[PDB]
Amino acid sequence: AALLQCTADTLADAVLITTAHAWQHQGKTLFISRKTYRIDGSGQMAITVDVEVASDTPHPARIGLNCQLAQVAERVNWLGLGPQENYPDRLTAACFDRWDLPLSDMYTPYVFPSENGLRCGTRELNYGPHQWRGDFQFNISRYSQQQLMETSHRHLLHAEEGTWLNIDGFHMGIGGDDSWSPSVSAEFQLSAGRYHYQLVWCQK
Amino acid sequence: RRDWENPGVTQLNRLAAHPPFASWRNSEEARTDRPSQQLRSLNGEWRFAWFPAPEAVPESWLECDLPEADTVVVPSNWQMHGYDAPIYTNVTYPITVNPPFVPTENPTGCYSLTFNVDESWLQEGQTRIIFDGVNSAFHLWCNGRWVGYGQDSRLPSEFDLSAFLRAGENRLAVMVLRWSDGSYLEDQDMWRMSGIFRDVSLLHKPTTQISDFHVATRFNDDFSRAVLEAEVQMCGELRDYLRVTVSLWQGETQVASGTAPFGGEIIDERGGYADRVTLRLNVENPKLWSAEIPNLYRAVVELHTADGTLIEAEACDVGFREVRIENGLLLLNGKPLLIRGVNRHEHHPLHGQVMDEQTMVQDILLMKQNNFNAVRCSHYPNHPLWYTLCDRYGLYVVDEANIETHGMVPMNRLTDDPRWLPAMSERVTRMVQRDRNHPSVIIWSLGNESGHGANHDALYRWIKSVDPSRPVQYEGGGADTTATDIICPMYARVDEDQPFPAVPKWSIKKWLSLPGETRPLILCEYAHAMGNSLGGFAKYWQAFRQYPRLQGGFVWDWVDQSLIKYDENGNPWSAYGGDFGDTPNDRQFCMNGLVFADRTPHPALTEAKHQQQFFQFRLSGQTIEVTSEYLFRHSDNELLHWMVALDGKPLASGEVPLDVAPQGKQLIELPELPQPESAGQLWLTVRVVQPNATAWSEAGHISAWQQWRLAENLSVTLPAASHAIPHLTTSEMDFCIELGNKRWQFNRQSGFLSQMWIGDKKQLLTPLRDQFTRAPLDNDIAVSEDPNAWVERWKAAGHYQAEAALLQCTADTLADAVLITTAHAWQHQGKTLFISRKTYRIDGSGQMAITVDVEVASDTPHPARIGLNCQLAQVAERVNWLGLGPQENYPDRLTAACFDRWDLPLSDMYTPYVFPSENGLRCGTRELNYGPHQWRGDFQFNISRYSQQQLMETSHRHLLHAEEGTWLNIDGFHMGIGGDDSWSPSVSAEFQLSAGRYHYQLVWCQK
């Protein structure tokens, strides 16, 4: 990520931070992310994200944010599709309601590790002291995407410090018509070029 | 006798039906299709008088001209002359349903003509009169003596006048009835008119004559050899010295010739036809006929004596081609056709139902120029010349019997009734006898919308028996009955089933594979082009190309059936149903074409041309792959032009010759495409151009095109920050922003940007506000004569009455700009429909960025659009934009459009549909310029002098008046237009605005 712009403005009842980043490769700009963080007198932080994706780069796996929380909590409570893991092209069975499970249930122990445990169509997510609200997809677990990608067998995974949270405005389908050629239907590829999403982070 | 109220009497004294004759007395003339001195036209000025019923006609008229009559041209429709009104009714019969009776008040047209006949015609031979088209029934007298009677308004009626004429002057008197029992079989959805509306002619034949001739062409397995078989029948005295010579020519070269005395092979225990003979001619390596290459030969049939004296000659154009269905596919010369068809009624805005050569040629050339290859004669045999033009220009034709009984209840009431078998039988048999030698006719149709009755089955078998050379189709009763060789539904959808009881309309893909089904499927009508329509056209084409047995269809339909009327000041205007005092009527349902009545194209015509292209393209790297869809010709009049542009900025271009065999492929490698000067999206556009003129096109014609996005270099450079900062002024009433010469005013009570000024000039007539509705299209309205209609739903939900409520309006000053935030709710009867949240950020550069986030209640019908609108104070000459174009395009009808920089006069941004509605949208626009304004983003827009309100309140385009200023509609999202049909919801799910939450962003700045 290359920083294009970062500013701070004071408002009547909030602080507004504006940012712009370019992701490049060998000189090619793959994606641009433009954001605004609005923190109000209420302690809520509204994040608005507008991303542009190069039409000539392969459609991305996801469009979201991630971070590693210091907290490690027992339960994960959310208002969205569940209770089990679900993805864009695999969520018909999931139902929209208020779910509450232990953190480890938010992990799917595929013998060969990979992205897993996403929950889509989520309007509110609760973990420890935090709450995120919007219209997103998310997974949460003690394993980073990096560890998942680097480990060949589930038994070798080790819990990292803290909790990794992946919150996506958009996520590609998983496919499966076959597992040896591209199999994700067009309608589930992130090819729109421009994407918008917004999240509200607060404590309480 | 009231012959006009008795289906058992369809004619009296009428001569047998037969192919086109001219009785040439010179063989060379016959070869070249020169006019014949023995076929005289009686077209021109006739005497006419109108009466309210046949009983009102004075006996005197039979022998003498009525002095009250007027002199009018024939052929004509009397309605077109103002004698009575034309009526526009779709399904309901125009007369009470009480077969076989008709009203007692029955408009009667009394035509007469005084004409000369030379002794020569009467000293020898036979003189007959031919009325190519009389609507709907008539009696004929000659020199005051009654001759005969006729029905079926769409086929010729011939009578022998030999015994009635005298040398010198003679007088014909024709009494034409508007309604008759034949009208029960003529319920087509079209204007109901009447009169002698096709040619009238006199033909002299010798006593010993050619009375019929049939031509067939049969082939070996690879079409390298053919046998032309010509069966000839004579009338008059059999004599051993008579002979028949049949000669075949290709241009000026004689290919073959054969002669024989009459006397056919033994047929049964009683012998053979002594009055017939069959000549058989071998033809090696025949040049085959197709719509791609309409190769034609000429067959000349001479009746003569052995000593060599010609008695008479007849002839026809011959197209060597085989039509057969095999293994589920319709084949032409052994290859599977892909029908790019259209239905076409005989309609002229000035002349009614009278056809003329110029209009016919104009229609065929526009058809060909737009990638059509076939036409359905909806729904009756056409004027004879149509077939000759189709044979010579090259179009596949569906010839259809003049039988439609749509208003009956149930639909097959008459067609299942044996008492109606005779009348129906003449409609089918006489069409076959007249048109069977035309190569352009590839399929016969039993009629249209008359249910499925036993009469149909009988007639289907009759045709199969007499003419095995062409498939027979019929859609009534469910589209797949025992009376059809082809599954030929009307308005069946691509993927969606419409499971109506008894006569469901399955998805076309599914229909082919129902249990036991094996026939090919070609829609007899599809893609209802009424008004702003043709949405989803591409979906049909994609399926036709993927599924072998989906062989295409006939779009409904070619031309709007609007008629010209004159205003109080004599200016012409386009009229429809009800505009003549006609009632009941079906209003605009008579206008469903791809072209306006004057032949100007509607915007949908380009979508059809593009989807109907004959070359398919794929890009891989720098490689363009061209595939030909032609079955018979090589691309011998085609070059490919390619162009690469950066945001409308031309980078490079080239030309490459195309040499693709039919069904073949060609790979073309594009040159090194060396780096673009700046950021943006590179676009590749390719066009197939015909460098040489043809019989149907001009040199330079473009026949196919396609685009792709190439590399994109996103802009990562920042804006050289403002030399200044805007200033905000707050007042209880408004939030005002000033920057140099500009000023923006936001009304605090309304929460909308209410005015803008450049220098001292106000820029707005009406404030910039959200808009969630559109002036309903014909498809939104959905009427063919439904509370599921989109319009109904919207109205019922209060979408057009909703009032905005202000939830919030605030101002904030940033380091370099002023930011206004608003939020509004649109409600109806307590219901919150939509919520619009926005931010307007005006910066040091003078640019106003508007961000809009809309929420749509999941339980209100999805809205027609999500955007903003305003009425600009200015009226500018041009509209310039970077987006799809140049013509009008909508979400589900934008494939033909191309992304480029377009610049048109304002007026072209308005599509004058007869029935006004939302129109002129242009999608995928990234930049729009008008006057001093520029708007940037990723939106759809329309711009015109007519507001949406006006368009939805106006019934006819001529009554529109330009408003002050310019109405701008800019949308983040717009619903598709639909059109699978125009009488039910037809907008596919993927084009409905059902996402709940929508976001869009606009930048408004000066130029």
Ligand SMILES: [Mg+2]
């Ligand atoms: Mg009758």
Ligand SMILES: [Mg+2]
């Ligand atoms: Mg002459």
Ligand SMILES: [Mg+2]
């Ligand atoms: Mg006389």
Ligand SMILES: [Mg+2]
């Ligand atoms: Mg009908």
Ligand code: NA
């Ligand atoms: Na792994």
Ligand code: NA
């Ligand atoms: Na096909």
Ligand code: NA
């Ligand atoms: Na119609």
Ligand code: NA
């Ligand atoms: Na060529």
Ligand code: NA
């Ligand atoms: Na209207």
